[PDB]
Amino acid sequence: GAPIHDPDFIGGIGKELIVDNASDVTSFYPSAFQEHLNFIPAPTTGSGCTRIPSFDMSATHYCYTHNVILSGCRDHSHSHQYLALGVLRTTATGRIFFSTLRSISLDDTQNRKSCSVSATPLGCDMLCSKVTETEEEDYNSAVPTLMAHGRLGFDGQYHEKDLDVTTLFEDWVANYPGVGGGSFIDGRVWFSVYGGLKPNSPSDTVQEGKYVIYKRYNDTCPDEQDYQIRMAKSSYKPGRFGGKRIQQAILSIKVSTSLGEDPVLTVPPNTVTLMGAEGRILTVGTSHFLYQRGSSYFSPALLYPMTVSNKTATLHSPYTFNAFTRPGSIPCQASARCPNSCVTGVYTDPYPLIFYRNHTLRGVFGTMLDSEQARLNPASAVFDSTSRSRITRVSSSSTKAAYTTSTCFKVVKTNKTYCLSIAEISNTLFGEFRIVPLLVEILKND
Amino acid sequence: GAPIHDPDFIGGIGKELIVDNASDVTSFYPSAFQEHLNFIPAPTTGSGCTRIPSFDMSATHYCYTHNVILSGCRDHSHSHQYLALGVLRTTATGRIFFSTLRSISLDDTQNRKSCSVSATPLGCDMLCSKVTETEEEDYNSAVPTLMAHGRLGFDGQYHEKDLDVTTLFEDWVANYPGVGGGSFIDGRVWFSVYGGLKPNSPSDTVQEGKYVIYKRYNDTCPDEQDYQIRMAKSSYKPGRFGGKRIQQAILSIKVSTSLGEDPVLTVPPNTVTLMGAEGRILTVGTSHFLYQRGSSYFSPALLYPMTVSNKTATLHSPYTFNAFTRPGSIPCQASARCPNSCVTGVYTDPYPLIFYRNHTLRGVFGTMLDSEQARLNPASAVFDSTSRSRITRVSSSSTKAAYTTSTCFKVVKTNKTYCLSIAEISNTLFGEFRIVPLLVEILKND
């Protein structure tokens, strides 16, 4: 009898929440922040660093995890992980609360990093990278980044198995997990991923030449056409890692009593994907979406529809929201409209919230950071391809923030739609960051 | 099969930690705060108020609870309690983390306040006072404060039974749990409760003329022996609650599947006890103590030796740790030495740490608010009968704070002793307070 959310939630997890062909996506907006049970551990010392939140939830249980670095967020020697496996429940007065059932600190010699979780029928699958050298150091590591598929079962026990990267990520130099969540689809769990591709490798050659240029809604990038093409053509090998091709990619693994069984990579064509970066594998109802961080020139939040057959996947022309920009360094700030070759941004995923009877997406929820270049002013709101709804603010004052990963669901019992935005926040006295789960109820005008 | 601490801990919970005869109690001291699994939920909204912690850990599991008011700590409207049942575990590296197994939000049609939890073999026993009026108002409500004995079972479910206060606390006008953890002894759960006595009632006339005068160690009170007796006599009828007799008591309930089964109140004779205040029932080894907050004139930490005979217990002359003082308010400041009438102070307890082979208590661990009147600057450390050891600070700046309670334990394996100190700390952005569980390893100078 494995852990399941309370009955008030059954049928309201990971499904298409608001199907309204009439009303305007934006008429829907986030209410003020709600007080729920804060299930994400805060730093217990003045220097402790807790970052990189990853979270997924299936119709039965939810998974969560983050990074813990004793000395400070800058130290990159060792560090452990925190994992949680729980279920949603309600109080007599119908308040909701994330009730973790298994809370453990996974800490041993091995230094995992940038890990992603996903709710599977066995427990909480986690995809990790185990590093020695720094990111910069590893991208030069001719040999591909070491990876391991782990899992925290309903029994509180943890087990993992390193994946044979010398083959799996053969044509790579660096290869880390998208940090965003993974999703379970057809007995398989699909994680996002990116990293470096060994130049001139079989893999590097098919992408060689392939580019793609997504544009802003109302801003037509001036710079001549020949200029834009060439720029994009190179936006896949930024100077940050010495021209190395940072390619997107999606890994799948068979979900069974054997961790890391039947892995399979799927390297989409840059003719459709953009510069590789952190991403999340979403699943709402019957649709699937690959979220990709805006680490390149494109600023608007993206969403590449995903389809699966066999053990591989297929991306498609991305859904986009212009109001959903992210802070980033010039020439790739929040308003950037021209293809360039940078590498910045921050993880801030959009959650599919409103569809059409024809099951096409329309509205999304998530937490952006209003600010051209710096990582400031968290902001929660509903977004359509163009505009933004009334917003709710973490703070009406300038505020330091980081990764924000959202997720919505409904309490059928109290017919209400809630959204969970796990946001990295600045913190005093106890470390650099506090990973707090903001909770909002989706309300609509009249 | 019930939950239980990893074997590395078995034998190191609720026992005498240090048995020394010559070593100076103060030669031991707290390590720098450690980085462990923050198991205490933090606010999630800008106004959420989380206060009044309560902790108790038996040889098998640990219980924890705190209160939560939505609109800010001053609002008296409604409120709900957060609960957690868990056990201690270790990582591959041998680090420790409090792994909670049952995490819930108790919120309903009732308002529970000033609750105290205790680890019973049936789960996590809780005692709360259900309020429908403010404290001042209830201290004038001829009738007794309604209460209930509840319990979060190992299965996750919570159950409670209202007590027949009109008979049980028949001689009281108000009565609440000491907020400080209770203890399980001889098949009954024991809680420290306090409140106001119904003037002229049997329970009240017997404490007539009874008092005690606790003096500081070095200092000496000038005042006449006459002026002293009176002051001490009237310290039990302070002016904050209309001269009512603020009384101290201990409630025992039988631990069984029937909640509230055969409870029994014990009202110690004021020839030994000071004015009624928040308390706690500690059990270290074969020794039972009673901690009494210093809401009256006596500044030093108090630990009343508690012996038990069936359903009733007896108290003895306290152990005073004259260095372990609390912030008061003139004339009852941290330095106070003469008997007076006041209802101030704060909750900051001392856990029985160091013992004589003859079981006599020699030293204690705790965290005091190192100030004279205001509630500022936390500070952890070992305390003997007269002085404080080296100190570990939350911060070296002026830091606002409040309640703090501590429990220590030994990791039999590496034979290392640790003290967990839960303290309400000042917080920013998210609520007026953040309850952070502090962790420290007790060290010996050389």
Ligand SMILES: CO[C@@H]1O[C@H](CS[C@]2(C(=O)O)C[C@H](O)[C@@H](NC(C)=O)[C@H]([C@H](O)[C@H](O)CO)O2)[C@H](O)[C@H](O)[C@H]1O
């Ligand atoms: C000067 O007017 C202020 O208007 C504020 C609007 S509502 C809200 C917001 O910005 O969304 C609701 C948020 O949940 C709240 N933040 C948190 C963390 O709970 C936010 C803060 O209160 C705001 O940032 C104030 O600093 O407010 C709100 O009514 C303020 O109280 C008004 O003073």
Ligand SMILES: CO[C@@H]1O[C@H](CS[C@]2(C(=O)O)C[C@H](O)[C@@H](NC(C)=O)[C@H]([C@H](O)[C@H](O)CO)O2)[C@H](O)[C@H](O)[C@H]1O
């Ligand atoms: C203020 O100068 C530094 O003091 C440090 C003392 S140790 C310690 C303390 O106050 O005991 C250890 C505490 O765990 C730590 N606080 C937290 C929350 O982790 C505290 C603060 O880090 C310090 O106080 C800063 O405010 O420090 C130590 O000697 C340092 O080397 C000094 O530079």
Ligand SMILES: CC(=O)N[C@H]1[C@H]([C@H](O)[C@H](O)CO)OC(C(=O)O)=C[C@@H]1O
């Ligand atoms: C593997 C790794 O180092 N991840 C880091 C990531 C990375 O630098 C970026 O995705 C460029 O690849 O960025 C950041 C960051 O706060 O922005 C934090 C992550 O820890």
Ligand SMILES: CC(=O)N[C@H]1[C@H]([C@H](O)[C@H](O)CO)OC(C(=O)O)=C[C@@H]1O
């Ligand atoms: C029942 C109740 O109200 N308890 C309160 C307690 C009480 O007032 C004291 O024991 C006598 O004054 O004080 C405080 C406080 O920070 O001091 C908080 C508690 O909420």
